[PDB]
Amino acid sequence: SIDEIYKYDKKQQQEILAAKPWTKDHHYFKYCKISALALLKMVMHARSGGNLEVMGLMLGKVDGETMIIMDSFALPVENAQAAAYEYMAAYIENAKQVGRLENAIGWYHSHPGYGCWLSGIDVSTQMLNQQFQEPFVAVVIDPTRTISAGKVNLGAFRTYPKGYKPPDEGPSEYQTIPLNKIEDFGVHCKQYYALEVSYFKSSLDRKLLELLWNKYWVNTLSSSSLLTNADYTTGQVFDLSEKLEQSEAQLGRGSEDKLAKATRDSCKTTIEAIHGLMSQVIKDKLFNQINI
Amino acid sequence: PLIMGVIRECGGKMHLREGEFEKAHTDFFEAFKNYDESGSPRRTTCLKYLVLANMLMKSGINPFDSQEAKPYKNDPEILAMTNLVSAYQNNDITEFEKILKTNHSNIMDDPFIREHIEELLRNIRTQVLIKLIKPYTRIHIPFISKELNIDVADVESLLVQCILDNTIHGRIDQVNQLLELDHQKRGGARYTALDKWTNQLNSLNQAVVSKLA
Numbered sequence A: 001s002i003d004e005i006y007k008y009d010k011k012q013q014q015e016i017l018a019a020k021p022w023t024k025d026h027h028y029f030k031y032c033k034i035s036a037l038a039l040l041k042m043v044m045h046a047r048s049g050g051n052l053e054v055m056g057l058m059l060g061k062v063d064g065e066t067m068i069i070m071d072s073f074a075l076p077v078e079n080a081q082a083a084a085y086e087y088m089a090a091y092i093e094n095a096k097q098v099g100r101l102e103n104a105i106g107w108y109h110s111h112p113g114y115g116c117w118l119s120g121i122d123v124s125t126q127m128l129n130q131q132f133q134e135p136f137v138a139v140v141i142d143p144t145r146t147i148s149a150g151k152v153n154l155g156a157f158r159t160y161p162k163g164y165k166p167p168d169e170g171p172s173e174y175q176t177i178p179l180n181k182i183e184d185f186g187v188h189c190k191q192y193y194a195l196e197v198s199y200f201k202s203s204l205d206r207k208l209l210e211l212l213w214n215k216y217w218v219n220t221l222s223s224s225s226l227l228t229n230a231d232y233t234t235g236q237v238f239d240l241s242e243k244l245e246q247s248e249a250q251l252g253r254g255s256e257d258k259l260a261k262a263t264r265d266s267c268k269t270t271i272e273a274i275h276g277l278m279s280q281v282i283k284d285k286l287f288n289q290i291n292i
Numbered sequence B: 001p002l003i004m005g006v007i008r009e010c011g012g013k014m015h016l017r018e019g020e021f022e023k024a025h026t027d028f029f030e031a032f033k034n035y036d037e038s039g040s041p042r043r044t045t046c047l048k049y050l051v052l053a054n055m056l057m058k059s060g061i062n063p064f065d066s067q068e069a070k071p072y073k074n075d076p077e078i079l080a081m082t083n084l085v086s087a088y089q090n091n092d093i094t095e096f097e098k099i100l101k102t103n104h105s106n107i108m109d110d111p112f113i114r115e116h117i118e119e120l121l122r123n124i125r126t127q128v129l130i131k132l133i134k135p136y137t138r139i140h141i142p143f144i145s146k147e148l149n150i151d152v153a154d155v156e157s158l159l160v161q162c163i164l165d166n167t168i169h170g171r172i173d174q175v176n177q178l179l180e181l182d183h184q185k186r187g188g189a190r191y192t193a194l195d196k197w198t199n200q201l202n203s204l205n206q207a208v209v210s211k212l213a
């Protein structure tokens, strides 16, 4: 009964909302589960956005310590209040009569080319949202690093309340943040915590994906990723050169050991380039070297 | 009501010799509405000067659609001005030249028309040439001379002025007398980034090595 996650009962949701346990503890929600359809919708919307930022809402429910996201929709944003809330209310009213019973559980927005984290404005927005409508979660997607690394870059964060000082306990995996966004990442890094993200899909979705792979391998075998992202690598090289200049300036005198961070960024970019090249080498071996 | 109109017209001419075409056009319009309630023979000259200003600054764009402009434009007393405006809007050098040639004793006689007819002709020629060179990659200069109806030397002078003023993006091949338009460009930002990376690496390794002793 894998499909049991799709069954929605309103009585249990009302009981949980009226018996809110998240008002006592603060590190309560630590698991986020996203449907396959919702994740694909976010990825396609972010990619269609281009090099700009796109934001939408996230419908779903709660289950114990788990935030479940089922669907999504894109806000116009050409706007905080007014237009955004009008669109949210109208879309929810329209979708409630066709079978979509769940209400909002979060908001998502894209961070194209500078990682998955919450800025100062995002932290303030999340604080405002969690003050009034709870529970809530903020999903940040990097649509450009997804193509470059061949991995879905997504992060679901939840913001600590004002005046609360958690005692350390931060793993904080390394993120290659550009130079002009390093200061913003430093001041607001301990005001939120990340939720571990998992994905789920139904049985018909699984069967359809298995049947789709029988003909979707052609696109994998003819990707040629070295050309789809040629400006991203140039921007990365520019940022890396600036970081190298700053590390050299630090060396001439006398972050901590900025040379190590610049080296890590250079290694990441170079490894992505070599992966893109070896894919084409494999294609050349398979298809062009059958010279009869 | 003649002294203030005359002084306004004189101030308009002085501004016309000194640029700042917006305020000159406003002064010309003020003189025009002053002459509307004054002597008829000055009205045609004021209309001529107003049209001269309009085609000189090429941004006012005031055709005969004005409700007060129609009763004077439709008057057969002055008609070459409407043809000149039509030629300017249509950007036809041939029609402009035929209007200038046919309409003698009414355009040549006025000196203020003559002191700016060269500028108007140069403006329309430049616009026509800019439109002409749009699709081509390498284009002969005698071809441009045939189209614009000027000799090859004047075409080369016009092209030199346009290229210097960063208006035409191309270069003149003088030995074989053609013009090559710079339409072939590629992604040269990657090599600039690589050069910057190389320079930073050079300085950084110099400093790191110099750190020891």
Ligand SMILES: CC(C)n1nc(C(F)F)cc1C(=O)Nc1ccc([C@H]2[C@@H](O)CCCc3cncn32)c(-c2ccccc2)c1
Residues within 6 Å of the ligand: A053, A054, A055, A077, A079, A080, A081, A084, A107, A109, A110, A119, A121, A122, A125, A128, A129
């Ligand atoms: C849930 C949304 C509608 N929301 N609710 C409330 C609250 F007042 F209720 C408040 C909000 C709300 O608009 N937040 C917000 C803040 C900042 C940005 C942009 C902003 O800086 C300028 C761009 C740079 C940037 C990088 N990261 C966020 N941005 C956005 C935003 C994100 C994607 C597209 C368009 C706008 C949304």
Ligand SMILES: [Zn+2]
Residues within 6 Å of the ligand: A109, A111, A117, A118, A119, A122
């Ligand atoms: Zn943001």
